[PDB]
Symmetry: D2
Subunit: 393 residues, 4 copies
Amino acid sequence: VQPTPADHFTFGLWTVGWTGADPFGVATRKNLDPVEAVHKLAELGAYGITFHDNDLIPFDATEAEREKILGDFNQALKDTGLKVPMVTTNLFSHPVFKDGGFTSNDRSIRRFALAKVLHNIDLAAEMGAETFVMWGGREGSEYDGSKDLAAALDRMREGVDTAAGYIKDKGYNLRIALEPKPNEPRGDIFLPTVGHGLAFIEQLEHGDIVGLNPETGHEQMAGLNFTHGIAQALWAEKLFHIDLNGQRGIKYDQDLVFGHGDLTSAFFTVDLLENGFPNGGPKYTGPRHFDYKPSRTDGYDGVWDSAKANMSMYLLLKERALAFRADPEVQEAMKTSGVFELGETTLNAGESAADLMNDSASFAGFDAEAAAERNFAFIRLNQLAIEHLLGSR
Amino acid sequence: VQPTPADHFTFGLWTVGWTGADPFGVATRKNLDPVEAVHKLAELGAYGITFHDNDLIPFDATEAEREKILGDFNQALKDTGLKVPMVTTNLFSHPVFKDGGFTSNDRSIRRFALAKVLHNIDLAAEMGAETFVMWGGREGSEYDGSKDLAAALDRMREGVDTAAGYIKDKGYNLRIALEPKPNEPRGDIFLPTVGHGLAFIEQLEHGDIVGLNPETGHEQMAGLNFTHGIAQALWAEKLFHIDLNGQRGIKYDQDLVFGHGDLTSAFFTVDLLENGFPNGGPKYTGPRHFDYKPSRTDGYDGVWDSAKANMSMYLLLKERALAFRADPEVQEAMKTSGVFELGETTLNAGESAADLMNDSASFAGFDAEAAAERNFAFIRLNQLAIEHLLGSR
Amino acid sequence: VQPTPADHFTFGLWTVGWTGADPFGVATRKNLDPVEAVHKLAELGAYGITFHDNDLIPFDATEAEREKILGDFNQALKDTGLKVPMVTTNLFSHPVFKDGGFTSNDRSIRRFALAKVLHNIDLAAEMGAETFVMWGGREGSEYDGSKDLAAALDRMREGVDTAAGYIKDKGYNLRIALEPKPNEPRGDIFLPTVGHGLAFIEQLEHGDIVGLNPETGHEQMAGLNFTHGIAQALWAEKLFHIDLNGQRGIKYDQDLVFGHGDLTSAFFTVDLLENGFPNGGPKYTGPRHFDYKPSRTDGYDGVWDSAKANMSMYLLLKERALAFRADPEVQEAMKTSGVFELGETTLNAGESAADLMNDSASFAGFDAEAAAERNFAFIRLNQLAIEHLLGSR
Amino acid sequence: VQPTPADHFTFGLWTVGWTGADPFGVATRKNLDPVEAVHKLAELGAYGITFHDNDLIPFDATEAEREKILGDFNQALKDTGLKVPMVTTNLFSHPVFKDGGFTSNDRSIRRFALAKVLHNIDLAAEMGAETFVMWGGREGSEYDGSKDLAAALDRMREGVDTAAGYIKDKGYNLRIALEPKPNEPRGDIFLPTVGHGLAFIEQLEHGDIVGLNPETGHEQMAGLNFTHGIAQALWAEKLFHIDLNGQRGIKYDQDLVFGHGDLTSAFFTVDLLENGFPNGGPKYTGPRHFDYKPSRTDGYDGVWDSAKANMSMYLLLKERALAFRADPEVQEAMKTSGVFELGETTLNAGESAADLMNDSASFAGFDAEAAAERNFAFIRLNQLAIEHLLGSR
Ligand SMILES: OC[C@@H]1N[C@H](CO)[C@@H](O)[C@@H]1O
Ligand SMILES: OC[C@@H]1N[C@H](CO)[C@@H](O)[C@@H]1O
Ligand SMILES: OC[C@@H]1N[C@H](CO)[C@@H](O)[C@@H]1O
Ligand SMILES: OC[C@@H]1N[C@H](CO)[C@@H](O)[C@@H]1O
Ligand SMILES: [Mn+2]
Ligand SMILES: [Mn+2]
Ligand SMILES: [Mn+2]
Ligand SMILES: [Mn+2]
Ligand SMILES: [Mn+2]
Ligand SMILES: [Mn+2]
Ligand SMILES: [Mn+2]
Ligand SMILES: [Mn+2]
């Protein structure tokens, strides 16, 4: 398994550039020059790079400095061929965002945060990005009385609709994607899961260009099924981007390499991305982006090893998932379990409610105890899946 | 604290009628006659009763028997004055529903399940219920390959839209409410949280009459903030009913008496229900329904004690929450923390995106480091809330 | 793969005999005869069968029925050659155990539970069991004021020490193993994890013959690392028996097939059980017991598929764990990461605390900045395990 | 309320000195001078102050700086009268501890970490501390193949036993206390719960002077009951010190003010610390230490508000716990539930296992169906605690 640009593997600058600072200790690695991240990622088979405005351009950069940096960064892109499919804003690091950007209690701070976002949209637009991601990191609270919850959602809506409205106004070919996270750094973050993100989108004036950016580990932080979460996003056609990584339980956001967390779950995510739905339906065609952090214990050879580990894991899973669905044995198991029967409408063509209620075969004389006898054989289907995954079939 | 019908305390028949059978042991209490539950609940101050079709009418009841039972149950209602505000269907107990009702893999079972629901709507309509609740208990899976996830959501939609369509067709003054649960009895249940329920509703043809029925313990089972979840439902105006209980962590569905789980959270739920949003907004005006189970260790005096404990806890919380918001000290704390400033729109009247981006006060010359100096004083606000709760103020 | 008796694969009667009654519904399968059970497991490659007293002998059974049942059961053992390596007592099913066996608040129930255990030691001894397991499923509470916590542990000690003294007094060749569980069916169960069980054993009079019986799923319900927990039990030489199964997350006890939960973790559990420690040390030599439940959606063909599935999963993982450790690249990766260096004592032979302190090379003139540069290469070592597990190397 | 030194309220320098740098952003407050800290806590009613070696003495400090810093610090102690009851070592901040102190894979780091601890015992002894706390924050791993689990525990034992032998050898009047944590910053930390710490202590050569230092929040991160866990440490006579704080759920370590997490649990923790056991037994007599962090959204007025808040919360709950137990209705409710009956031994004075077995009244002729009817009235007893806690009785 050798990744090629065709594979569409994208990495964030903050991923491989992650310094090692955690809540209990300082950085273990020296800062990484962005030019060098580009060159290194290009040599590994990456297709593109993504960043946060402050990952590239310092908060206090002068204009001459801003120009220099972009010149260097575009030079690296031009020399290597890397694309920049997504750009994002840092609304969490500076002490000004301690209560949030868009949902800060302070109105002057909310204004500043939306201005930071609008300028960042211009940047994204000039970099040629297709997606613009919003992670509301500091949006939430530690205490239930800190906020007016209907007012926090109005202020969130205001911000996203101003940003969406501006995109349309300028005619940029950009979509907004929201990234849910249940907690950390706040005790409770607003729009904590894929479901809440989807629900909020439907209340927006400019919801047509607003979608989701689910992250593996974040749904697993609420103990949810990541594959089910992204299936719901797909089904609603709001899967605009994805962040792949690993999480080993309900605890702090680990951001491990993709497949280094829940393996079986990783396996079914890849099947969903590659094979789509058994009965057909929408398919995700965007970048396969890794939002992970090289463990702080590892030094620079470890940083490039971990980058590579993401792409290897994905390709190894993909091979197995393709083999899995191609197996005649598996296709037979699927049939028996009623995976294909779930695809059939419950009602007959032009059958009404009333028609079903008096159909005696369906209710009045339906043999409930004979129907309960079906052996779904879901265990055998799971065993087959795991045998493909272990490459023993 | 003495509950009166005015309070709108509703109880399910299965709550006080819960027998004590769990996964590791048999029933510890004898079955409770429904007539006796009515009479007992009436004497305690209940406003009404709710039930599942099979809580009242056995699965295999003959027509003569069905008639008898309803006659007895309506007699009890007439004698005591209890209303029946909500009715629900059991799509989980019989062995036929082992893979679900609406999303079973077997099409004949899906047909039977929707027929069971349609007949149950007629029943609800003749009982004078305002709400009809759907809990998809067996809808989900243990294994990721068991289902076609886009097909499971199409089949879920079919069912709910047929039911919604039928309501409109018959002209019943009934609303449908979905109840989310993350897991148990399935490893993963579809529409696992308030957020996912809300998101699914927006894909329905008849979504105008479909809302939510969040249960305290169920959101706490994913480690979410129940108050935030219901605030999102309110804000979207989809809070059609609620099930109040307690949960002491991420573990099996406990269904403890309301306030016997997370107390501080219970306190802020009650404030939200009673006081509404600090800056104004929608208010929940339906029944305050308890979906709990008297612990299996307790015998019949314990059953009526626990019923009473629900209503006492609610009234005690309500007193404290009303006192809390009325306190001048608390109103001052709120002001300082910017609870009222969150209510102000971020943008000025007729201010555009572009207007904000060039306003130099808001970005270019905004003093980020002086703005970061604000002391939100959220700890002091929480301390005041807890002092009201402990009745020390 | 194909299992044989030399593999030491043991199953409980209650596993394959699990009929499907959960808290939300009735049984989906017919009762399994115990003689059928024995013949079927023996045909599958099993080495032994385990049981709870009431799995074989009904609570009500007269002395005549006891003897009839045992005689048929012993014949089947005889005909097949299956051993009975472990025996256990049901102290959780019957309503009398609603507040516990050994720690019930009621003194007369405590005496009855102890008598029940004493009788069961005699049947255990008589069957040839080497281990007697005690799972305190009803020992605990829902509310914190329910028990005197010091008195609960004294009563727990008293039961265990009487059971252990009785073995010693009779000279039975039996050991007691305690099975930890954090919750379910109690809100909080006493001795909730491997650590707490281990700690308790040290306060016993007859501690020398009391060890543990860890269960995969149970430590995973507190979000703990199962391999770390069994490592500590081994290390302390207290790993007397084991229950292997799967669990996906912190939720209700699932008891899935071993390998159908956390796959990566299952792999490293197999590596510690089969292979032991990289620097050498203790080894677990007992039965590989499976405590699982065949999913209720499946029929009897699924029950027998699932028993096979436990054994295949373990053998597949065993193969992979062997290949992984045998790999020269892995051994070299292990060396780089300091795996073997951890095995060297910190102090030199004869060195004292005072010698280490004043050694200027270990403290005063130690270059902490230089030592921090070490690449431990833990991501790379984890990637090599995963590739071995995917059968990619 | 108002706290006084007789209350034994102790705070760590790192608590009020916590500047706000989290994993997603920089400090929001200015550094706190340690002399300012002492004066301010002494003005608040505190009895003592605790610290980590690097909280006072920088890692880099020369011998001259060490002495200057200590002299100013000792003066402040002198001027205020605050004691220094506990001292601890930072083995987690500096990059050299990226794989642990005592269990680092690197032998030279292990020696450096032990020397660092030995030097710190000398400063502890010299300050008048009675307790020396050890929190192994970097001891553990992200991946299961990273460590030899038996070698990790031997190295952990070796460090602790050298530290304990050195105290004994010098005749310092000091005890070692281990602080358990399940994860963060490591994916899995060794000795993750109270049980595991307790179990480990029993494998030590110098176990007699080694106990535990439970922290509220940490046991709650594994979803465990904190009162049950401290009860077992007490019971074993290993509760040497304690850290009190708040945590809302299984997520990142929050370290909220004590009482701002799980309120009901906080109440029952206060009842065990102040009041002890209902049937009598052990009592914890040490300092009531608060290990928390003032929320980063608040300024210095919030820091001092939060220190006050810890002390008020504890005193408010203490009042309520006293009134609760003193209440004659509660005492009578306790009696009904068997709280005092649990305190009676199961066996009669002189009775043997063989006597209990053959007593026909305890087994053979016991009416299990009659005994099962007992109403334990645990819901009613929990309701009485809650009403006392709400200051309603
Ligand atoms: O890939 C997207 C980025 N990932 C970061 C953390 O999850 C966010 O700031 C943002 O959504
Ligand atoms: O109050 C509603 C009822 N509660 C039960 C369990 O939560 C469901 O069947 C249904 O939603
Ligand atoms: O194999 C062990 C047995 N398994 C059951 C479930 O955990 C227990 O009763 C007992 O410990
Ligand atoms: O008060 C105890 C201290 N608290 C810190 C955080 O848990 C530890 O380093 C140490 O155990
Ligand atoms: Mn993340
Ligand atoms: Mn991300
Ligand atoms: Mn529930
Ligand atoms: Mn409910
Ligand atoms: Mn189990
Ligand atoms: Mn078990
Ligand atoms: Mn902590
Ligand atoms: Mn601590």
